[PDB]
Amino acid sequence: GISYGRKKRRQRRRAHQ
RNA sequence: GGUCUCUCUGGUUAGACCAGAUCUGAGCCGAAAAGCUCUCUGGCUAACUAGGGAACC
Protein backbone atom coordinates (compact mmCIF):
# COMPACT_ATOMS: atom_id res chain seq x y z
CA GLY A 1 0.00 0.00 0.00
CA ILE A 2 3.06 2.24 -0.13
CA SER A 3 2.05 3.53 -3.56
CA TYR A 4 -0.08 6.68 -3.61
CA GLY A 5 -2.44 5.23 -6.21
CA ARG A 6 -3.45 2.31 -4.02
CA LYS A 7 -4.40 4.77 -1.26
CA LYS A 8 -6.74 6.35 -3.81
CA ARG A 9 -8.13 2.90 -4.63
CA ARG A 10 -8.33 1.89 -0.96
CA GLN A 11 -10.23 5.12 -0.24
CA ARG A 12 -12.40 4.68 -3.34
CA ARG A 13 -13.09 1.05 -2.38
CA ARG A 14 -14.02 2.00 1.19
CA ALA A 15 -16.37 4.74 -0.05
CA HIS A 16 -18.37 2.20 -2.08
CA GLN A 17 -19.44 0.20 0.98
C1' G B 1 40.08 -21.22 -33.11
C1' G B 2 38.38 -21.35 -27.79
C1' U B 3 35.56 -18.86 -23.58
C1' C B 4 28.88 -16.35 -21.48
C1' U B 5 33.81 -11.58 -19.57
C1' C B 6 30.59 -7.63 -21.18
C1' U B 7 26.46 -6.08 -24.06
C1' C B 8 21.96 -6.36 -26.90
C1' U B 9 17.52 -9.62 -28.47
C1' G B 10 14.20 -13.90 -27.60
C1' G B 11 12.62 -17.35 -23.74
C1' U B 12 11.87 -19.34 -18.61
C1' U B 13 11.53 -18.52 -13.49
C1' A B 14 11.35 -15.24 -9.48
C1' G B 15 10.96 -10.44 -7.04
C1' A B 16 9.20 -6.33 0.80
C1' C B 17 10.18 -3.29 -7.59
C1' C B 18 7.11 0.79 -10.47
C1' A B 19 2.12 1.70 -12.39
C1' G B 20 -3.28 0.60 -13.20
C1' A B 21 -7.83 -2.46 -12.04
C1' U B 22 -13.31 -3.83 -6.90
C1' C B 23 -15.32 4.78 -10.54
C1' U B 24 -17.48 -2.31 -9.95
C1' G B 25 -11.42 -8.38 -9.16
C1' A B 26 -11.18 -11.02 -3.87
C1' G B 27 -10.10 -11.95 1.14
C1' C B 28 -8.35 -10.27 6.50
C1' C B 29 -8.66 -6.37 10.61
C1' G B 30 -10.57 -1.82 13.44
C1' A B 31 -15.56 1.80 16.85
C1' A B 32 -13.47 4.75 13.27
C1' A B 33 -9.46 7.74 10.26
C1' A B 34 -7.02 3.65 8.64
C1' G B 35 -4.09 -0.91 8.17
C1' C B 36 -2.71 -6.13 6.19
C1' U B 37 -2.69 -9.95 2.32
C1' C B 38 -3.85 -11.27 -2.80
C1' U B 39 -5.44 -11.89 -7.97
C1' C B 40 -5.28 -9.82 -13.08
C1' U B 41 -2.66 -6.44 -16.99
C1' G B 42 1.64 -3.33 -18.63
C1' G B 43 6.64 -2.23 -17.33
C1' C B 44 11.20 -2.68 -14.51
C1' U B 45 14.94 -5.47 -11.96
C1' A B 46 17.55 -10.10 -10.98
C1' A B 47 18.85 -15.19 -12.01
C1' C B 48 19.34 -18.71 -15.88
C1' U B 49 19.44 -19.98 -21.14
C1' A B 50 20.16 -19.67 -26.60
C1' G B 51 21.72 -16.52 -30.25
C1' G B 52 24.20 -11.72 -32.52
C1' G B 53 28.08 -8.32 -31.56
C1' A B 54 32.10 -6.84 -28.72
C1' A B 55 35.93 -8.10 -25.41
C1' C B 56 39.80 -11.18 -23.52
C1' C B 57 43.28 -15.71 -24.05
Residue numbers in the entry: 44 to 60
Can you list sentences taken from the study reporting this PDB entry?
Herein we report four crystal structures of this 57-nt RNA, both free and bound to HIV-1 Tat. In both cases, Tat induces a substantial conformational change which positions U23 in the major groove of the A27-U38 pair, forming a base triple. In both the co-crystal and NMR structures, the central U23•A27-U38 base triple is sandwiched and stabilized by two G-C pairs (G26-C39 and G28-C37), as well as by two Tat arginine side chains (R52 and R56/R49) that are co-planar with the flanking G-C pairs. The guanidinium groups of R52 and R56/R49 not only form hydrogen bonds with the Hoogsteen edges of G26 and G28 but also stack with the base triple via cation-π and van der Waals interactions. Essentially, these two flat guanidiniums mimic third nucleobases in the major groove (like U23), forming two pseudo-base triples (R52•G26-C39 and R56/R49•G28-C37) which sandwich the central bona fide U23•A27-U38 base triple (triangles). Unlike the NMR structure, the crystal structure places R49 of Tat in direct contact with G21, making yet another arginine fork interaction with the Hoogsteen edges similar to R52 and R56. Tat projects the guanidinium groups of three arginines, R49, R52, and R56, to recognize the Hoogsteen edges of three guanines, G21, G26, and G28, respectively, with R52 making a central, indispensable contact. Strikingly, while the flanking R49A and R56A substitutions each had only ~ 3-fold effects on binding, the central R52A reduced binding by more than 400 fold, in agreement with its in vivo importance for Tat-mediated HIV trans-activation. Any nucleobase at position 24 sufficiently supports Tat binding, consistent with its solvent exposure and cation-π stacking with R55 of Tat in the co-crystal structure. Although our Tat helix-TAR structure seems to require the crystal lattice for stabilization, it demonstrates the structural feasibility for a conformationally constrained Tat helix to fit in the TAR major groove, induce the U23 triple formation, and make highly similar contacts.
The HIV-1 Trans-Activation Response element (TAR) RNA, located at both ends of its RNA genome, is one of the most conserved RNA structural elements in retroviruses. It assumes multiple, dynamic conformations to carry out critical functions in several stages of the HIV-1 life cycle, including reverse transcription, proviral transcription, genome dimerization and packaging, viral translation, and immune suppression, etc. Here, we report crystal structures of the full-length HIV-1 TAR which reveal substantial conformational mobility in its three conserved bulges and in its lower stem, which coordinately maintain the structural fluidity of the entire RNA. We find that TAR RNA is a robust inhibitor of PKR, and primarily uses its lower stem to capture and sequester PKR monomers, preventing their dimerization and activation.
